[PDB]
RNA sequence: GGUUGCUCGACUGUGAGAGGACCUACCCACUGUGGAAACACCACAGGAACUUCCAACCUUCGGGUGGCGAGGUAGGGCAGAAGAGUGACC
């Protein structure tokens, strides 16, 4: 099918704030849906925001942004819209896009998510990561990688070798310094041999900061 | 008034091809307004069940929801592997709409002890000042592991951080980040730098270490 | 002058269990299904039950057909009718 939901107009937001977050629909006419706005602070759960109804343009609102937040549809541009204003920090979150299915399909289910857009009320500004490499060592397969030291805020993206090399990565979740930065680490495995011969770069990008870098990662240099 | 979903358990672990139940409460009368979902980490929900009972189009058979008055239960009857996921009821009976707090799953397998290096601060970065000592535990399970840093054979205690992978849902096993962070003056003191792993799938603790300075 | 038939009739009525079902149009409603539909807009089916009624149609006079939102607002139906007449008869 080509049933979509694209979110944006999420990132990094002072407290007291406003953003609009958009909701563009792809496969189907949202104007025969109900159109529904759901967030999930980091590693917390699924919290209901609002909703819009067809044919009626009704709107119900979580009680936690009553009043703060507004939702609404364009059906010419096929687009939901979400007007927040005087943001929280704990507004914080992922932002997702969600069509409420048809009756007779799949009940008051919703059927249709997006990949949702983040959400980040901070003051605190945004910083690019330092890129280091973690050289591999003896002792068949060894290991190396790549750390993404102190930036703000989430997300980066690591990929080896331009997402040539995919197997055997593991891209840890950022913890948060003490800073208040992030710093994580991507590691790969591979077998000794290749250390000689085989180019390995790290792929590193932070859209917040728009900063791209890649770190050719290689062995003990003596 | 909003009417609450008390979902329980927070978290369940359970063997591949058990069954496993998941609970759901409805402080009020919801008639079957409830619908389960299965999110992955990082990825946005999918729909399992629409009218307490119904399974959603494509979804397997393994799955299914039931009511009994205000407890809503769905029920996988095998667990395969994939279904690693945090899994929530939602009530849509009346406005606001309520979500349980959600129920993560683990997979289960044998043991497998951790693979274990230890990355020395890179180059660039000492030059910087920051020297970030780096200590990795690769697939491994269960995911219940205590490092230890030992600088000189002096224990450290309040200077690592780690984080830790999900269940990769095709190994079903972990790895594990502990990052030891000094000032390039604390670590410039110092020969050893250690990283003391204790698994259960490894009978003794496993030492990787490295001096300051070695080529 | 009684009495009583015949006609025009101001106006009042439509009576709820020991007893209220007349018609039509607007509005305003109450309840469920359906409309790509949780509310709103729409179409449709329905106003607990047992009863009471026939203002309505049909009848072979045996009985049959059809019919309920006690919401308003109007036009009518059916029932009275104060008054006008108007006869027959005493």
């Known amino acids: 099918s080509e049933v979509q939901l694209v979110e944006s107009g999420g990132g990094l937001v002072q407290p007291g704030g406003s953003l609009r977050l958009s909701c563009a629909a792809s496969?189907?006419?949202?104007?025969?849906?109900?159109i529904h706005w759901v967030r999930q602070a980091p590693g917390k759960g699924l919290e209901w925001v609002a909703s819009?109804?067809?044919?009626?343009?009704?709107?119900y609102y979580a009680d936690s942004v009553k009043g703060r937040f507004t939702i609404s549809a364009d059906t010419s541009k096929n687009t939901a819209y979400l007007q927040m204003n005087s943001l929280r920090a704990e507004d914080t979150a992922v932002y997702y896009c969600?069509?409420?299915?048809?009756?007779?399909?799949?009940?008051?289910?919703?059927?249709?998510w997006g990949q949702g857009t983040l959400v980040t009320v901070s003051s605190a500004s945004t910083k690019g990561p330092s890129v280091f490499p973690l050289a591999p060592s003896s002792k068949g397969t060894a290991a190396l990688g790549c750390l993404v030291k102190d930036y703000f805020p989430e997300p980066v993206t690591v990929s080896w070798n331009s997402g040539a090399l995919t197997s055997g990565v593991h891209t840890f979740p950022a913890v948060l310094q003490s800073s208040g930065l992030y710093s994580l680490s991507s590691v790969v495995t591979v077998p000794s041999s290749s250390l000689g011969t085989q180019t390995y770069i790290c792929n590193v990008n932070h859209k917040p900061s728009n900063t791209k870098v890649d770190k050719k990662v290689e062995p003990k240099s003596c | 008034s909003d009417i609450q979903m008390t979902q329980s358990p927070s978290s369940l672990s359970a063997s591949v091809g058990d069954r496993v139940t998941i609970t759901c409460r409805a402080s009020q009368s919801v008639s079957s307004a409830v619908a389960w979902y299965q999110q992955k980490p990082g990825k946005a929900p999918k729909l399992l069940i629409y009218?307490?009972?119904s399974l959603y189009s494509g979804v397997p058979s393994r799955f299914s929801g039931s009511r009994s008055g205000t407890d809503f239960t769905l029920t996988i009857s095998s667990l395969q592997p994939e279904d690693f996921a945090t899994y929530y009821c939602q009530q849509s009976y009346s406005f606001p709409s309520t979500f349980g707090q959600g129920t993560k799953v683990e997979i289960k397998r044998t043991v497998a002890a951790p693979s274990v290096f230890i990355f020395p601060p890179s180059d660039e970065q000492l030059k910087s000042g920051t020297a970030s000592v780096v200590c990795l535990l690769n697939n491994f399970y269960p995911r219940e592991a205590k490092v230890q840093w030992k600088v000189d054979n002096a224990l450290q205690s309040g200077n690592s951080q780690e984080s830790v992978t999900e269940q990769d849902s095709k190994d079903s096993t972990y790895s594990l980040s502990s990052t030891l962070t000094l000032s390039k003056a604390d670590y410039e003191k110092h020969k050893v730098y250690a990283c003391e792993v204790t698994h259960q799938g490894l009978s003794s603790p496993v030492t990787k270490s490295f001096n300051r300075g070695e080529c």
């Open positions: 819009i109804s067809p044919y009626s343009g009704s709107t």
């Open positions: 496969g189907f006419y949202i104007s025969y849906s109900s």
């Open positions: 009218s307490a009972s």
């Open positions: 969600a069509r409420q299915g048809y009756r007779r399909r799949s009940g008051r289910g919703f059927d249709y």
